[PDB]
Amino acid sequence: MNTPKEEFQDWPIVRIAAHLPDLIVYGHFSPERPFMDYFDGVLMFVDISGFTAMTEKFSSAMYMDRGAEQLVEILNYHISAIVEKVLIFGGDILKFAGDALLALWRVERKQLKNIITVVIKCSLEIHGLFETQEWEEGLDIRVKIGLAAGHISMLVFGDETHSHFLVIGQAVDDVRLAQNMAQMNDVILSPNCWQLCDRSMIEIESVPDQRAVKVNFLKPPPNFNFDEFFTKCTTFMHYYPSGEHKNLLRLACTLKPDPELEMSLQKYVMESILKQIDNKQLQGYLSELRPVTIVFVNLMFEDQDKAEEIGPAIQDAYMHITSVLKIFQGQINKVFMFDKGCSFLCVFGFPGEKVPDELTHALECAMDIFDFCSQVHKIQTVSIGVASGIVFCGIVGHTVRHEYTVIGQKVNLAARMMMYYPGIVTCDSVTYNGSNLPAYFFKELPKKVMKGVADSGPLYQYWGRTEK
Ligand SMILES: Nc1nc(Cl)cc(-c2nn(C(F)F)cc2Cc2ccccc2OCCN2CCOC[C@H]2CO)n1
């Protein structure tokens, strides 16, 4: 009897799983929201921002109206190479953004030391990809890497149709500290990463006024063989493709149809993405330069606050945020947490939600969210930035691991605004001027210098309908 080769296993459940980390795909947890779990691992934050020069440019007329198509292509070309490196070195990519991706190696505590060595080697090989590389002629693409190690809590929150996840805690705050001081071509170790690592492997230098450390060199001992060392490390790596599946980048590529699993996983993914996955919309339809309004919501908590207090508060906030976004036709594109703040990157416009008064409505949605979230137990401060303009939208990443992502100066501006103008709703000139609203609904603000933004134009506070 013939034995034909198995065909390409390209099921919906596999396609959905490309949009999610192993943390979620193989997580099997309770239906309760919030859900929290606790573990240890190593985090790697790869800063891919070295391409502001790109996204702006691609809206230029020289791109003959194929700006978004070209941008997705060149971006995924570079990011795909980063993603293969992470996956091959046994990491789990948690999330992508316009400025970054974040990857996890989850391990038992005893193995933290050895996995840090794996992750440092990975980092150095990532820098290696970009040593003589440039987006065009004479404009250089390099990355910056922050690494951390230690305790990690995971939070899953959401409702009956939508789910969202975050990591929080020691290693997350640490990787933020590490990435904030990393420069081009750096690999920075958090203080705890430096405390836990194998100091005989690496030579570091101190970073002035900092307990975080920079890697100069990975100098292994005489008898060290990385491939043998890596193989021993894989003993502790639950889902590393192996045996008959060692030719695959992810075990998730082997997922078989399972309606209960797919029902759970699809809740993390946008309906417009599911449509493409089900071959009910063209595969290139979501790559676009689109005029949108970004509403970037920051929920701050006190230093005292741990996961078990944060979780219910984010859940309560979320339940209100989603109800407002549903009304005013908005989407949560991303959720992030760093600097004691859980942020929601919300978007008005873009896939099929393109309704007029996008601007008045974005402002009122923002105020509604601000007023409600301010009353949530344990939420110390709410801050919301609102910016409107042309942004890149697209599925970013590798074939086997990618996410729908929004990229552009308006995204970055909204993010700085909520950070540098805490406790209020702020908006940019486009939103202000384009709103069908009287001037006294606003307050014109002092110009601040915001790290990673140049010439923001006049910024305003959305005061609201009344003096109060
Ligand atoms: N807390 C948390 N949990 C998960 Cl599962 C993912 C993230 C996360 N992913 N990504 C990105 F790479 F896609 C970013 C984050 C937030 C984050 C966590 C630790 C350290 C830094 C960090 O984000 C850096 C700031 N960057 C700039 C300002 O806007 C928010 C953020 C996302 O682009 N954060």
Can you describe what's shown?
Helix 11 runs antiparallel to helix 12. Strands 1, 2, 3, 4, 5, 6, 7 and 8 form an eight-stranded mixed sheet that branches. The chain has helices at residues 12-17, 22-25, 52-57, 67-88, 112-129, 170-181, 191-196, 226-234, 259-266, 271-277, 307-328, 358-374, 409-420, 429-434; strands spanning 35-47, 92-97, 100-106, 144-158, 163-168, 187-189, 202-207, 210-218, 288-300, 330-338, 341-349, 381-398, 401-407, 425-427, 442-444, 460-462. It is built from 14 helices and 16 strands. The protein folds into two domains: 34-252, 2-Layer Sandwich (Alpha-Beta Plaits); 285-468, Nucleotide cyclase, GGDEF domain (Alpha-Beta Plaits). The protein is α+β, with helices and mostly antiparallel strands and 468 residues long. Mg(2+) 2 binds at residues 47-48, 99. It is found in: Cell membrane; Cytoplasm, Cytoskeleton; Cytoplasm, Perinuclear region; Nucleus. Residues 42-179, 293-418 form the Guanylate cyclase domain.
Topology (SSEs and partners):
Layout: H1 12-17, H2 22-25, E1 35-47, H3 52-57, H4 67-88, E2 92-97, E3 100-106, H5 112-129, E4 144-158, E5 163-168, H6 170-181, E6 187-189, H7 191-196, E7 202-207, E8 210-218, H8 226-234, H9 259-266, H10 271-277, E9 288-300, H11 307-328, E10 330-338, E11 341-349, H12 358-374, E12 381-398, E13 401-407, H13 409-420, E14 425-427, H14 429-434, E15 442-444, E16 460-462
Parallel strand pairs: 4-6, 12-14
Antiparallel strand pairs: 1-3, 1-4, 2-3, 4-5, 6-8, 7-8, 9-11, 9-12, 10-11, 12-13, 14-16, 15-16
Helix pairs in contact: 4-5, 11-12
The structure holds the ligand Nc1nc(Cl)cc(-c2nn(C(F)F)cc2Cc2ccccc2OCCN2CCOC[C@H]2CO)n1.
PDB class: signaling protein
Keywords: soluble adenylyl cyclase, adcy10, signaling enzyme, class III cyclase, signaling protein
Assembly: monomeric
